[PDB]
Each structure stands twice: as C-alpha cells, then as structure tokens.
Design a protein around this motif. Structure first.
Motif, PDB file in Angstrom:
ATOM      1  N   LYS A  42       0.849  -1.180   0.000  1.00 39.34           N
ATOM      2  CA  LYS A  42       0.000   0.000   0.000  1.00 39.34           C
ATOM      3  C   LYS A  42       0.890   1.236   0.000  1.00 39.34           C
ATOM      4  N   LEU A  43       0.681   2.142  -0.948  1.00 38.63           N
ATOM      5  CA  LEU A  43       1.482   3.364  -0.973  1.00 38.63           C
ATOM      6  C   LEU A  43       0.793   4.472  -0.182  1.00 38.63           C
ATOM      7  N   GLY A  44      -0.533   4.463  -0.195  1.00 44.13           N
ATOM      8  CA  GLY A  44      -1.274   5.480   0.516  1.00 44.13           C
ATOM      9  C   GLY A  44      -2.767   5.423   0.285  1.00 44.13           C
ATOM     10  N   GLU A  50      -7.497   4.104  -2.595  1.00 45.03           N
ATOM     11  CA  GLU A  50      -6.259   3.600  -2.023  1.00 45.03           C
ATOM     12  C   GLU A  50      -5.350   3.238  -3.177  1.00 45.03           C
ATOM     13  N   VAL A  51      -4.064   3.525  -3.032  1.00 43.33           N
ATOM     14  CA  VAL A  51      -3.110   3.317  -4.107  1.00 43.33           C
ATOM     15  C   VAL A  51      -2.065   2.287  -3.682  1.00 43.33           C
ATOM     16  N   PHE A  52      -1.842   1.296  -4.543  1.00 46.94           N
ATOM     17  CA  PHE A  52      -0.918   0.210  -4.264  1.00 46.94           C
ATOM     18  C   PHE A  52       0.186   0.124  -5.314  1.00 46.94           C
ATOM     19  N   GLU A  53       1.383  -0.255  -4.894  1.00 46.49           N
ATOM     20  CA  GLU A  53       2.384  -0.677  -5.859  1.00 46.49           C
ATOM     21  C   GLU A  53       2.015  -2.099  -6.223  1.00 46.49           C
ATOM     22  N   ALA A  54       2.218  -2.491  -7.473  1.00 46.99           N
ATOM     23  CA  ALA A  54       1.881  -3.850  -7.873  1.00 46.99           C
ATOM     24  C   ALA A  54       2.773  -4.311  -9.001  1.00 46.99           C
ATOM     25  N   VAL A  65      -1.729   0.589  -8.715  1.00 51.48           N
ATOM     26  CA  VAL A  65      -3.147   0.303  -8.780  1.00 51.48           C
ATOM     27  C   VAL A  65      -3.923   1.212  -7.854  1.00 51.48           C
ATOM     28  N   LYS A  66      -4.866   1.950  -8.428  1.00 52.81           N
ATOM     29  CA  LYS A  66      -5.718   2.853  -7.677  1.00 52.81           C
ATOM     30  C   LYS A  66      -7.116   2.256  -7.542  1.00 52.81           C
ATOM     31  N   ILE A  67      -7.394   1.684  -6.371  1.00 54.13           N
ATOM     32  CA  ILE A  67      -8.695   1.096  -6.088  1.00 54.13           C
ATOM     33  C   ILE A  67      -9.627   2.188  -5.594  1.00 54.13           C
ATOM     34  N   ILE A  92       1.516  13.039 -19.617  1.00 53.47           N
ATOM     35  CA  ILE A  92       0.273  12.614 -18.963  1.00 53.47           C
ATOM     36  C   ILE A  92       0.478  11.187 -18.449  1.00 53.47           C
ATOM     37  N   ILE A  93       0.088  10.905 -17.211  1.00 55.82           N
ATOM     38  CA  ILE A  93       0.225   9.548 -16.700  1.00 55.82           C
ATOM     39  C   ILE A  93      -0.563   8.594 -17.604  1.00 55.82           C
ATOM     40  N   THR A  94      -0.001   7.412 -17.838  1.00 55.28           N
ATOM     41  CA  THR A  94      -0.624   6.422 -18.695  1.00 55.28           C
ATOM     42  C   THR A  94      -1.480   5.446 -17.902  1.00 55.28           C
ATOM     43  N   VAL A 110      -5.197   0.935 -13.264  1.00 46.59           N
ATOM     44  CA  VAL A 110      -3.796   0.526 -13.277  1.00 46.59           C
ATOM     45  C   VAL A 110      -2.991   1.533 -14.085  1.00 46.59           C
ATOM     46  N   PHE A 111      -2.004   2.146 -13.445  1.00 41.48           N
ATOM     47  CA  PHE A 111      -1.201   3.213 -14.074  1.00 41.48           C
ATOM     48  C   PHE A 111       0.256   2.805 -14.219  1.00 41.48           C
ATOM     49  N   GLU A 112       0.942   3.457 -15.148  1.00 41.88           N
ATOM     50  CA  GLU A 112       2.372   3.271 -15.271  1.00 41.88           C
ATOM     51  C   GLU A 112       3.011   3.635 -13.934  1.00 41.88           C
ATOM     52  N   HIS A 113       4.117   2.985 -13.614  1.00 46.05           N
ATOM     53  CA  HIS A 113       4.814   3.254 -12.369  1.00 46.05           C
ATOM     54  C   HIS A 113       5.902   4.286 -12.624  1.00 46.05           C
ATOM     55  N   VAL A 114       5.948   5.319 -11.785  1.00 41.86           N
ATOM     56  CA  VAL A 114       6.982   6.345 -11.871  1.00 41.86           C
ATOM     57  C   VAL A 114       7.927   6.260 -10.674  1.00 41.86           C
ATOM     58  N   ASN A 115       9.201   6.018 -10.938  1.00 39.30           N
ATOM     59  CA  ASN A 115      10.186   5.990  -9.864  1.00 39.30           C
ATOM     60  C   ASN A 115      10.512   7.407  -9.413  1.00 39.30           C
ATOM     61  N   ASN A 116       9.598   8.027  -8.671  1.00 36.15           N
ATOM     62  CA  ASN A 116       9.762   9.446  -8.343  1.00 36.15           C
ATOM     63  C   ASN A 116      10.496   9.703  -7.032  1.00 36.15           C
ATOM     64  N   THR A 117      10.837  10.970  -6.808  1.00 31.71           N
ATOM     65  CA  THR A 117      11.333  11.433  -5.524  1.00 31.71           C
ATOM     66  C   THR A 117      10.261  12.355  -4.958  1.00 31.71           C
TER      67      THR A 117
HETATM   68  O1  LIG Z   1      -4.245   8.938  -9.173  1.00 33.97           O
HETATM   69  C1  LIG Z   1      -3.491   8.656 -10.135  1.00 33.97           C
HETATM   70  O2  LIG Z   1      -3.693   9.043 -11.311  1.00 33.97           O
HETATM   71  C2  LIG Z   1      -2.106   8.090  -9.836  1.00 33.97           C
HETATM   72  C3  LIG Z   1      -1.269   7.709 -10.882  1.00 33.97           C
HETATM   73  C4  LIG Z   1       0.005   7.226 -10.611  1.00 33.97           C
HETATM   74  C5  LIG Z   1       0.466   7.167  -9.292  1.00 33.97           C
HETATM   75  C6  LIG Z   1      -0.354   7.575  -8.245  1.00 33.97           C
HETATM   76  C7  LIG Z   1      -1.631   8.056  -8.530  1.00 33.97           C
HETATM   77  N1  LIG Z   1       0.093   7.535  -6.958  1.00 33.97           N
HETATM   78  C8  LIG Z   1       1.309   7.029  -6.639  1.00 33.97           C
HETATM   79  N2  LIG Z   1       1.875   7.076  -5.428  1.00 33.97           N
HETATM   80  C9  LIG Z   1       1.342   7.405  -4.244  1.00 33.97           C
HETATM   81  C10 LIG Z   1       2.184   7.366  -3.140  1.00 33.97           C
HETATM   82  C11 LIG Z   1       1.735   7.755  -1.886  1.00 33.97           C
HETATM   83  C12 LIG Z   1       0.389   8.047  -1.712  1.00 33.97           C
HETATM   84  C13 LIG Z   1      -0.484   8.008  -2.790  1.00 33.97           C
HETATM   85  C14 LIG Z   1      -1.964   8.330  -2.564  1.00 33.97           C
HETATM   86  F1  LIG Z   1      -2.577   8.618  -3.704  1.00 33.97           F
HETATM   87  F2  LIG Z   1      -2.076   9.351  -1.735  1.00 33.97           F
HETATM   88  F3  LIG Z   1      -2.545   7.272  -2.035  1.00 33.97           F
HETATM   89  C15 LIG Z   1      -0.017   7.668  -4.057  1.00 33.97           C
HETATM   90  C16 LIG Z   1       2.153   6.647  -7.668  1.00 33.97           C
HETATM   91  N3  LIG Z   1       3.379   6.223  -7.369  1.00 33.97           N
HETATM   92  C17 LIG Z   1       4.209   5.815  -8.341  1.00 33.97           C
HETATM   93  N4  LIG Z   1       5.411   5.379  -7.978  1.00 33.97           N
HETATM   94  C18 LIG Z   1       5.739   5.373  -6.545  1.00 33.97           C
HETATM   95  C19 LIG Z   1       7.212   5.116  -6.240  1.00 33.97           C
HETATM   96  C20 LIG Z   1       6.165   4.022  -5.983  1.00 33.97           C
HETATM   97  N5  LIG Z   1       3.835   5.838  -9.639  1.00 33.97           N
HETATM   98  C21 LIG Z   1       2.625   6.264  -9.983  1.00 33.97           C
HETATM   99  C22 LIG Z   1       1.746   6.702  -8.994  1.00 33.97           C
END
Ligand SMILES: O=C(O)c1ccc2c(c1)nc(Nc1cccc(C(F)(F)F)c1)c1nc(NC3CC3)ncc12
Length: 327
Positions: A42-44, A50-54, A65-67, A92-94, A110-117
């Motif tokens: 779970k990312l947040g 709720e957003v998950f890494e998957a 994955v954004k449920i 634009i996010i894919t 389901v979105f592309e994963h971004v290795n962000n800071t």
């Molecule tokens: O809503 C969308 O369109 C969308 C699209 C793509 C991402 C996204 C949301 N949220 C992401 N992260 C995130 C982290 C913490 C909290 C939350 C929260 F939303 F608050 F739950 C989200 C996220 N993280 C990564 N890569 C990170 C390094 C693993 N890549 C893409 C995304």
C-alpha cells in the motif's frame, strides 16, 4: 447576477468533438483481467481511493493500482474517459488498464509506475535549471490537456510525479479533472486549499483552464522562493486573505467588480486593506540563486486575480524564463 466568462483559448474544443468524446456518462468501460496484477504494498490512501504498488505478472513490470473508494458515482466514468482521451499525450500519466477489484467491488485503475522522488525531499534539492526544466515539462502536460478540452483542477506538488534520475515528469490524479464547455458552471470545491484560484475562493463558478495556471503559479512561487506552500492559509477564507496580502485588496475588488461578484460578508472583519507587493520582497540570501528577473516576471504573469488575465499554458511556454532550458 454575475457576469459570464469564457476561456480565451480552446474555447470550443469539445463543442466540435464527437459527443462520445466528452459525454463520459455514456462511456462503456473496457475491463481487463484482474488476475494480471498482484498487489505488493500500500502506498497510501486518499479521500477517494487507495493506491498500491503492484506487479503486472504478464510482463513482470511494476505498476500502480488505484482502487476507487465507492465515494461518488459517474465521477468514476469521468476520470476514466479523461484518462483515455489524454493517453499518450506529453507527460500525462498512462492508464494501462482498468479491472474490477473483487474485494472493494469497485473499479481499480492501473497506471504506469513512476520511480519518483517525493516533492517533500525533491524541492529542496532543485537547482534554478531544474525548476525551469520541470516547469516547462508541466506546461507541456497542461497545454496538452487544455488543447484537448480538459482542465485538471488539482495541480499541486503531490500530483506532479518526477523521476529525477531520468528527468521524467508525469501529471497524475485526474480524479477532479473536467471537460470545459463554454458557459458551464462548475463546482468550486476543487483543488487543494493552497492552490485554489481566487475564482474558487470568491465562489465564481464559470471558470476554465486558467484555474490550472493559478495553481502552477503557486507551485512556482513555492519553488523559486523556497516556501512550500507559498500561500499558507488556515482555511478557505484565510487563504484569500493570504493572497490579498500579496496581490493587494484593490485589485481583488477590481476582479470581483469586473464579474459583478459579491464577496462573502464574512470577509468584512478579516480582509483589511493591503497594497500590492513587489515580488522582490520574498527574495533572500537562501533563495536568490533560484530567482531571476525572468522568473519574477513569469510568476507575476501567472498569479493574477482575473483568470482571464493569466498566461495560457502555450503563452507561458513562450516566456523568456524558458530560454535557458534546452529544447
Ligand atoms: O491517481 C493517479 O492518477 C495516480 C497515478 C500514478 C500514481 C499515483 C496516482 N500515486 C502514486 N503514489 C502514491 C504514493 C503515496 C500516496 C499516494 C496516494 F494517492 F495518496 F494514495 C499515491 C504513484 N506512485 C508511483 N510510484 C511510486 C514510487 C512508488 N507511480 C505512480 C503513482
């Protein structure tokens, strides 16, 4: 009543698109295979999801994955249609897929994963060059969605994901995004407090793409001045007071007067009288390396009370601030 307003650009983009383009309520979702994605962590959690890494086990690629919470209804189709309309556009996010989550009983995007800071770590390391570079990258994303008849309405640091290693940027979370239709009145309860345009704060509903440009200006101010957020209001009323302390009250009155808008009378005891300030007062020894005459002029041209007076995304991309950025 209030005076009407129209976008000064891309005014009729949806007017002349096929109905299927903007009539999201009739959108038929194309479902993928829920078994393709295994949740990793779970990312947040947001008010809406709720957003998950998957991992996508059909390519072993990381995804997100954004449920969606059962919070709201046709809002789901709106976000989906917008993501599909904008897919492949610059920065634009894919949206890779949409599946039915069997536990939540709601759609899972389901979105592309971004290795962000995270912006909380990234902003204090950005150089003058980085700021101009990434601002230009955001502008590409904003001109694209605006040119495609869509306003984001929630531009803020959290929604601009940056992979600082590969210098790659993605605008995310289109859950508040809407189609622009000339003359349409919109909900003013969008955007995060610190990034809400004066139009929202004065309860003016006939706004447009230019809202996103105010939000971008707020981001710029926080980056070049090293104060995040820049307008740090305690609530939506104080938010307008914070803004008025910088842009001044006389121009706020000119704004509401132009649109024949009346301020909430609760501002009578809190707003005061304030001169417009020069941007140089926010410059100090710890942020001056991020400030230039070009940056101040650009910021000045984004942060206007009058949404019709703000730079458009395309005009912004023409600004001297970006001359130093490599094309
Ligand atoms: O809503 C969308 O369109 C969308 C699209 C793509 C991402 C996204 C949301 N949220 C992401 N992260 C995130 C982290 C913490 C909290 C939350 C929260 F939303 F608050 F739950 C989200 C996220 N993280 C990564 N890569 C990170 C390094 C693993 N890549 C893409 C995304």
């Amino acid at each position: 009543g209030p005076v009407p307003s129209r976008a000064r650009v891309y005014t009729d983009v949806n007017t002349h698109r096929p109905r299927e383009y903007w009539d999201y309520e009739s959108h038929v979702v194309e479902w993928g295979n829920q078994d393709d994605y295994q949740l990793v962590r779970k990312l947040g959690r947001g008010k809406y999801s709720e957003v998950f890494e998957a991992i996508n086990i059909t390519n072993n690629e990381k995804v997100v994955v954004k449920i969606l919470k059962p919070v709201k209804k046709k809002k789901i189709k709106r976000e989906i249609k917008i993501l599909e309309n904008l897919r492949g556009g610059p920065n634009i996010i894919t949206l890779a897929d949409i599946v039915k989550d069997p536990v939540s009983r709601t759609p899972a995007l389901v979105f592309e994963h971004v290795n962000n800071t995270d912006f909380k770590q990234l902003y204090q390391t950005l150089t003058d060059y980085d700021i101009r570079f990434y601002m230009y990258e955001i502008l590409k994303a904003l001109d694209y969605c605006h040119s495609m008849g869509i306003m984001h309405r929630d531009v803020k640091p959290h929604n601009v994901m940056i992979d600082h290693e590969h210098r790659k940027l993605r605008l995310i979370d289109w859950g508040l995004a809407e189609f622009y239709h000339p003359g349409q009145e919109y909900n003013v309860r969008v955007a995060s407090r610190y990034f809400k345009g004066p139009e929202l704060l004065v309860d003016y509903q006939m706004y447009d793409y230019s809202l996103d440009m105010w939000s971008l200006g707020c981001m710029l101010a926080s980056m070049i001045f090293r104060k995040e957020p820049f307008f740090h209001g305690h609530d939506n009323y104080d938010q307008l007071v914070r803004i008025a302390k910088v842009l001044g009250t006389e121009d706020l009155y000119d704004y509401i007067d132009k649109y024949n808008i009346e301020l909430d009378p609760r501002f009578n005891d809190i707003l005061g009288r304030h001169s417009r300030k020069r941007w140089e007062r926010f410059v100090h020894s710890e942020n001056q390396h991020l400030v230039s005459p070009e940056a101040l002029d650009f910021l000045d041209k984004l942060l206007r009370y009058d949404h019709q007076s703000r730079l458009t995304a395309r005009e912004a991309m023409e600004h001297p601030y970006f001359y130093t950025v490599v094309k």
